[PDB]
Amino acid sequence: EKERFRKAPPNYAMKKTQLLKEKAMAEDLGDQDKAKQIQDQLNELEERAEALDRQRTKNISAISYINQRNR
């Protein structure tokens, strides 16, 4: 009942959700389920990447810049 109205991607269930969605898409021989899972996974990946880049936007982006510049 708690998971019903509470969004799955909040907050640490992202990667586990990605793996579970990939398994669900793979386990289905129907094309509609595969396409829906692909779209959902793409949206979740985009959101998670944006969230991770926002968190690493400061103090980690700088050192990545200077590491690429170092090498």
Partner: protein
């Protein structure tokens, strides 16, 4: 005009030997089925030459970076052998020596 334009694509990027025409195409194919329909929809081609010297394949929104390997082990004289003359009237266009291997 007469320049080597030889490319060697893998099984999952097999392009049609003829231009895409509505009278030569049909619907026969359907994670399991996602790699099946990609054979006859994404596979006309424009090999872009960049400033670094390398090339890439442009068959849609996705770009596959290719390398024109100059392999001197198969010095085959590629020719357009269409049947009009005595037997396969091969036209001497270019000898295939460099194989470009595309990949994702």
């Amino acid at each position: 005009g007469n320049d080597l334009y030889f490319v060697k694509l893998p099984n999952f990027l097999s392009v049609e030997p003829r231009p895409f025409d509505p009278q030569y195409y049909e619907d026969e194919f359907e994670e399991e089925g996602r790699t099946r329909l990609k054979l006859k929809v994404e596979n006309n081609a424009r090999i872009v030459k960049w400033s670094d010297g390398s090339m890439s394949l442009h068959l849609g929104n996705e770009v596959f970076d290719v390398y024109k390997a100059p392999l001197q082990g198969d010095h085959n004289h590629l020719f357009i052998r269409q049947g009009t003359g005595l037997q396969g009237q091969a036209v001497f266009k270019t000898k295939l020596t460099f194989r470009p291997h595309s990949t994702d």
